[PDB]
Amino acid sequence: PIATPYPVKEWLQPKRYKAHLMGTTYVYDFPELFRQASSSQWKNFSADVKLTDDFFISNELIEDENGELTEVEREPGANAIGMVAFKITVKTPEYPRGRQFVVVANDITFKIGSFGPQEDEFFNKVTEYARKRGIPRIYLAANSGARIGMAEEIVPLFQVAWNDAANPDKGFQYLYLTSEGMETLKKFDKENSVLTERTVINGEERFVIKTIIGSEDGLGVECLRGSGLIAGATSRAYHDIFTITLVTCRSVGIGAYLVRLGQRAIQVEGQPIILTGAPAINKMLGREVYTSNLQLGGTQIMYNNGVSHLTAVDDLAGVEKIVEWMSYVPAKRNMPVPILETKDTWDRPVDFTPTNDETYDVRWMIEGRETESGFEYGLFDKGSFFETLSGWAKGVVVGRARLGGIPLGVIGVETRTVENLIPADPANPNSAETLIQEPGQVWHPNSAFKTAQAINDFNNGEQLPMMILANWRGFSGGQRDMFNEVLKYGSFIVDALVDYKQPIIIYIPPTGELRGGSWVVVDPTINADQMEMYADVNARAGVLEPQGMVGIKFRREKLLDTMNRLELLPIYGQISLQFADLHDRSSRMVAKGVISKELEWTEARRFFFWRLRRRLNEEYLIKRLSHQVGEASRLEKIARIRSWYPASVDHEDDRQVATWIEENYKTLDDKLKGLKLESFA
Amino acid sequence: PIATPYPVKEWLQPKRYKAHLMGTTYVYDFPELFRQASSSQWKNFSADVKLTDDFFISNELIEDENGELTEVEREPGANAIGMVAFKITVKTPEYPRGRQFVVVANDITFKIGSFGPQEDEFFNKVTEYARKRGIPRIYLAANSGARIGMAEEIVPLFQVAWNDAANPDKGFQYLYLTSEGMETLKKFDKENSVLTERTVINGEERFVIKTIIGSEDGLGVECLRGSGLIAGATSRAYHDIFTITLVTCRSVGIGAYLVRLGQRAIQVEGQPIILTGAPAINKMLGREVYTSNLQLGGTQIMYNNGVSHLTAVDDLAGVEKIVEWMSYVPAKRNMPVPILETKDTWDRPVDFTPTNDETYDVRWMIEGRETESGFEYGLFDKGSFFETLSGWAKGVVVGRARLGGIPLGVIGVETRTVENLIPADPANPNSAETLIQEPGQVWHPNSAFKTAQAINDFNNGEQLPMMILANWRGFSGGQRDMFNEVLKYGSFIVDALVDYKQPIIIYIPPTGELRGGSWVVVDPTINADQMEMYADVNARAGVLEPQGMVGIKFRREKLLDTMNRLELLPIYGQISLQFADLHDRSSRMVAKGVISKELEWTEARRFFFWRLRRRLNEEYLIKRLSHQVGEASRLEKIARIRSWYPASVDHEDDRQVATWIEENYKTLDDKLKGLKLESFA
Ligand SMILES: O=C(c1c2ccccc2cc2ccccc12)N1CCC(N2CCC[C@@H](C(=O)N3CCOCC3)C2)CC1
Numbered sequence A, B: 001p002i003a004t005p006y007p008v009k010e011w012l013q014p015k016r017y018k019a020h021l022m023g024t025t026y027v028y029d030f031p032e033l034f035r036q037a038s039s040s041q042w043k044n045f046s047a048d049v050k051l052t053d054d055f056f057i058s059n060e061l062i063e064d065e066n067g068e069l070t071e072v073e074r075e076p077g078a079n080a081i082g083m084v085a086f087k088i089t090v091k092t093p094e095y096p097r098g099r100q101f102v103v104v105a106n107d108i109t110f111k112i113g114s115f116g117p118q119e120d121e122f123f124n125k126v127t128e129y130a131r132k133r134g135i136p137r138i139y140l141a142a143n144s145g146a147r148i149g150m151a152e153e154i155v156p157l158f159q160v161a162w163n164d165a166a167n168p169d170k171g172f173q174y175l176y177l178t179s180e181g182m183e184t185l186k187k188f189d190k191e192n193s194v195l196t197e198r199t200v201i202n203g204e205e206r207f208v209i210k211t212i213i214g215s216e217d218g219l220g221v222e223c224l225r226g227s228g229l230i231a232g233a234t235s236r237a238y239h240d241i242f243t244i245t246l247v248t249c250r251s252v253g254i255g256a257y258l259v260r261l262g263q264r265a266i267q268v269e270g271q272p273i274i275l276t277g278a279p280a281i282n283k284m285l286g287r288e289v290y291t292s293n294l295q296l297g298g299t300q301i302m303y304n305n306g307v308s309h310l311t312a313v314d315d316l317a318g319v320e321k322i323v324e325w326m327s328y329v330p331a332k333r334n335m336p337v338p339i340l341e342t343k344d345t346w347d348r349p350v351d352f353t354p355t356n357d358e359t360y361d362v363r364w365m366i367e368g369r370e371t372e373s374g375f376e377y378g379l380f381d382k383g384s385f386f387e388t389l390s391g392w393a394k395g396v397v398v399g400r401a402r403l404g405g406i407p408l409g410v411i412g413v414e415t416r417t418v419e420n421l422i423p424a425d426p427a428n429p430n431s432a433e434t435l436i437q438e439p440g441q442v443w444h445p446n447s448a449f450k451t452a453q454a455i456n457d458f459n460n461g462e463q464l465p466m467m468i469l470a471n472w473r474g475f476s477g478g479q480r481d482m483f484n485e486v487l488k489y490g491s492f493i494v495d496a497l498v499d500y501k502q503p504i505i506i507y508i509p510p511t512g513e514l515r516g517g518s519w520v521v522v523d524p525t526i527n528a529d530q531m532e533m534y535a536d537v538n539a540r541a542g543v544l545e546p547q548g549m550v551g552i553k554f555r556r557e558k559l560l561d562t563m564n565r566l567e568l569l570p571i572y573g574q575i576s577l578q579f580a581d582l583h584d585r586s587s588r589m590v591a592k593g594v595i596s597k598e599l600e601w602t603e604a605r606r607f608f609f610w611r612l613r614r615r616l617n618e619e620y621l622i623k624r625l626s627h628q629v630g631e632a633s634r635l636e637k638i639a640r641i642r643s644w645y646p647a648s649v650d651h652e653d654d655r656q657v658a659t660w661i662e663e664n665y666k667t668l669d670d671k672l673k674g675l676k677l678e679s680f681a
């Protein structure tokens, strides 16, 4: 293209054009999308703030002589391998002074973004770089899978020993090389390119090739090993640092697994996440079964799956989502969660409230709802809800949110029935579309899976506190759900709670209820160190429902002796039912001591803001002790800590306790590093 | 019953009869089934050995004044709660001097084996008892779920305020008590049995009951909390000690979850594992959908599921299976795996061998096969294979086995196609039976799940080494398997390998092959500390299959320039195919360094016996260091250790190295506790 306003980009670097033809942003152009999204981040936070370009820095990382990664300021497109990386330091609303993270990306223009040994070792190096520093690892996937190839240097000179040169079609018995070919190899030192055995046939000495190795690296198994390396590296990263992947273009094989192993994934529309491509599958099956890879790894598959937590219309959209996702995540492992107070102060009542006779969208209880007569504030900061895995197991709603600025994970129950429509298998003529009804307030294998998945993703990397607006009547005990292993996924929940390292809040909502199976799997005793449970005064909880209670311990026989109070069954049935429902009240929960407090929905936001803050504060103090004393149970540490509180401070006063602690961080700090003389040997 | 030979048992204890009517062994009679099974254990080991009753001891455990568990020798049936336990010390072939473990069981005769607070705290206490001592925790489930009930003391005197005594049917507005009733309660101190509010209606002062609490404990939520307690306790136990559960009778609610949380489960035939019973489900749905609980939790469900690892014809059968399962498990956490050498010495060739043109049952490669012309020894000790999860995901075969006495976990690939027949959902008129073809040498969501599940169960509790006869062409990339999240389960594999704490051996079999996706997820670099990979000389491995290799890097264009060697496509296609297959040879794997050694199947058993032994020996030494020095990488520790080997010892000689180490345990022990002066402060 001639006569363009500015210096033609796709020409100074033709790769940029190739990247675009492929349908993805050019790898070296990504850092810019992060600057843009970071800018947009500030615009939404404070429309006024004036930004300087030094608010965002991106330094490429390449390996030096020692194989050590360093920040080099070189020109785009000069990458020797098909894998690039950048260390980004950017000031954000949560981290005004700056926060860092790394970005690793395949370079789709370099050998179709294949994964070769060199790319794998680079990928592994970078992942370790991030983990060491405890900073997030963002991965931009646009690849073709493990790199392949043959020993091309052996294709022009391989001879075949036939059954008779007269009729080649009669077959052969082995391939070989002539003493001439053997020399050709020896001339280029490409001798180890083949394992042979010299054997003199009546004709001449022919070297039978028993194995082809190849002089060039990255043809077969050496590539598979590299994949495993990064697979294991990523599995490890997920429990260490915040991990997220943007499928910016096709992602195949190891590329697909890398997406899942980092768990958190945002898939750009039309960018398939696949194992074996459609063409190759059709070939293998002989028939033309599939049309596009999108049938195998499109959003309609992976987003409905749960592999994709979110979808994006285009790369920039995805980058914005990543950046938005990180706003609730600590700057680096073990730092306090990033607090970001906004216009929505904590001191206000909760507007929206559910009704036992009015279908509602739990999201309204969460973020709030916009009505004709104004806006109804929910429990959390307005506009702070960031839902994820929204295309899978709609039975539960999971997302990040803020409570007076305090970021946290949130799990709500979808009350409306879900219409899960499963496509037909194009590989089966007998395959037919199927609609699955997913009853509200009930766990099914997929919603139990999504719950545990959410819990683990909140805990690992994100290191976030969490609140579950628990409201389930139990797990589906039907035969289908039971056959589909609902017991394994329910247990996954228990496992994930036991692993949680941040404060957890279980709260049964106003019109909510927690019954039998459901209560079990979320009870605070599962993790006494981090869990606390609260029942709204208008919530219900019992081993069974009122109906089941009368159906077992209020039989017709007992209903009769009751007739001695005044056919009439229609109303005496409602007397027993109500008799039972009177046991399932928060008051009994308090009386029996299974919950910490019965709360009032409208006053919840206020209460939880201070409880969470008071707890985050005591936790910080609890850890400082841990990494100082050594032998001492939690009970002991928290006691030694609360013993430092002024005599006049009411330990049960969340605000008071939180306020005092924040006013004495340094005094307490001395008190801590004063216990250094705790060298019990 | 009169005139019976010996003292009538079901009469001295009527409970025994009730237990039997229920279809299960009487809880106090179980210790005897363990003695029997232990006896049978010896009979099979050495038919000669003469046993004394002191070879087996069972002491009941109950809580003392302090709530501490102690061994009391009291008479059967005297249990105050509906939960019993026994500490069993028994001499076995693996542990001639004795090995211990605990047995906890519901007492189905006590309040239908319900789970009340008291039973839960007892259950939790016992589980902690075992964990502390690191001994196995066997659980015998026969229960009815969380205990329920109402405030019965409030049913004879609750008054109802109607709209008019004339027409009760017109409804009411609230229940209450008379100053007389209030007194009745006060007389028995059962005052906290109800939360009320006095209000004088034109008539008289009536106390409105706002909440019913109940004087008796174990009616509602307090039971759900106890369940959670033991759920979390069991989730924890699984990663700590060897856990197993025998569903000896119905197991419900928390009872069902307890089964899954302990993971390893043996289900007696006809004993359902359920959440909500069929009757109650039918009631809730109005219609008569299900006939028996077996449709919901029978073996046809749970055994096909994977929830049940094995099924048993009767209790004794199950006990025998438990006892058999434990024979490969260490006496208690962290002890060496129990070695048990039998007639099948290590020094022999491997008989059975697969053929590329003859369907075989991988189990023959494992245990061996019995032919008409004698017995063909497999890779492992004859009669030592103990398969588990045999009713689920037949695509893979998992079990325990011995290699010259060394117990280990084994994962083999089923080559035959699996005919998975899924039942119809009786709750859907449109539901129809469905047969799923599961292609051999291919991972599907369920077989990938079973693989990871097996790996984790081998690692946790069992603490066993493991060998995987890896032979997969890859994961199914079809749309159905892909939509059914095959990527999540494949990754579960990577996760489980990263967690493995014992030596691992990956071995591609004689006619086996490991391709693309499959290699990735099992490569040694995933866990360099514990993994090692070996390829049989007759195995194949490549990123793709030969066909796919020619289909990409040996196109018709290149096939032509090849025509310059002598329509003829049918044979020139086989020349290219063979050209590719020449890259996929173990020789290249060695050349490229992705495997440790290429082996010969017949000599495998011999080789692996010494490699595994040499490794178990070095591991022991590696740990002793760890729990002594502190800061030192694996690389350093193993080097400091191999530096102690005599100069003449060949580090690569497994037998030599193992032999020397075993001949110097105490000399090495001194060398270790000599590094105590390693007090770097
Ligand atoms: O309390 C009862 C109950 C009865 C219990 C015992 C005897 C008779 C009962 C009758 C009941 C009638 C209506 C509702 C609940 C009843 N429960 C039985 C049903 C329980 N559901 C929990 C949530 C999932 C439900 C379930 O398993 N499903 C949902 C519908 O599809 C089939 C599978 C079961 C809740 C507790």
Ligand SMILES: O=C(c1c2ccccc2cc2ccccc12)N1CCC(N2CCC[C@@H](C(=O)N3CCOCC3)C2)CC1
Pocket: A276, A279, A280, A281, A283, A284, B439, B442, B473, B474, B475, B476, B477, B478, B515, B516, B543, B544, B545, B546, B547, B548, B549, B551, B552
């Ligand atoms: O090597 C090939 C291959 C080709 C690759 C690239 C271009 C053309 C190919 C043609 C092939 C033709 C026959 C076999 C393999 C072929 N592979 C493609 C198929 C791969 N399978 C791995 C195991 C599971 C297979 C799969 O996804 N299935 C199994 C059948 O049901 C649909 C889903 C795919 C194995 C690797």
